[PDB]
Amino acid sequence: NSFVGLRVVAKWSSNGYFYSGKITRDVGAGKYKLLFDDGYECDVLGKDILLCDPIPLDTEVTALSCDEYFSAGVVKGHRKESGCLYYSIEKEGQRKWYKRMAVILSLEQGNRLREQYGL
Amino acid sequence: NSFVGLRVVAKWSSNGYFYSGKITRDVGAGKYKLLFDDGYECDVLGKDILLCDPIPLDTEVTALSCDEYFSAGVVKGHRKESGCLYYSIEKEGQRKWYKRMAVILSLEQGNRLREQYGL
């Protein structure tokens, strides 16, 4: 049951989005240190951490982009190119590719995925 | 007079990068509430906030990319298309376009700009 170095989607704020990152260390009491893709390293409780290296397909997510700001869409495909992972988020009936860090889950979506994928 | 609604590059961690965002509110004691482009809204001290809506040209920055991870480069141009702003970061003698959220300043790089652009 090694959970070190596994990419996970976890929230680091009491009321915030579930941002993507990777587990850098497994501390006691189920509190894992996560280095997030944006460079912020901090400790997060297992409940707040979702063990989803590939974002599940056909899962509602929040896509962050300069255009449309914080849109809501559904994953409709994955594409790993030269290590870079992209998710095909369908917003308003239109599929667009978003980087791993450009896709984060809302509180409701994170809670929905916690039941199945939750540390 | 007011700094609210002005894009700024500020750090929200004691030892962290200067992430881009926008001032959502001006609170007392020079402590401004910033909504960052990643959706994290929190209060930041004026020292940690850099007033640079367009990232300064010919300024050393840290480009975050899936490939090359946290590379370092220098801005060599800007391009705003349909609101989306891209910076031409020159890494290893090669100019590559990065989104606004894809470019963040390091501790030393951000400090170097504090003397000029610092709240």
Author numbering:
A (entry chain A), B (entry chain B): 1484 to 1602
Show sentences the authors wrote.
The DNA damage response protein 53BP1 (p53-binding protein 1) influences the cell cycle dependency of DNA double-strand break (DSB) repair pathway selection. The localization of 53BP1 to chromatin also requires that it binds histone H4 di-methylated at K20 (H4K20me2) via a tandem Tudor domain (53BP1TT), while BRCA1-BARD1 recruitment requires unmethylated H4K20 recognized by an Ankyrin repeat domain in BARD1. We show that a series of water-soluble small molecules targeting the methyl-lysine binding cavity in 53BP1TT function by stabilizing a previously unknown lowly populated autoinhibited homodimeric state of 53BP1TT in which the histone binding surface of H4K20me2 is buried within the protomeric interface. Our work therefore identifies an auto-associated form of 53BP1—autoinhibited for chromatin binding—that can be stabilized by small molecule ligands encapsulated between two 53BP1 protomers.
Using NMR spectroscopy, we independently verified that 53BP1TT-CC mimicked the homodimeric state of 53BP1TT bound to UNC3474. Noticeably, the addition of UNC3474 led to the splitting of several NMR signals in the 1H-15N HSQC spectra of 53BP1TT-CC. The addition of the reducing agent dithiothreitol (DTT) changed 53BP1TT-CC to a monomeric state as expected, which, like 53BP1TT-PN, had no affinity for UNC3474. As we showed in vitro, 53BP1TT-PN and reduced-state 53BP1TT-CC cannot dimerize and are thus insensitive to UNC3474 and to the related, lower affinity compounds UNC2170 and UNC2991.
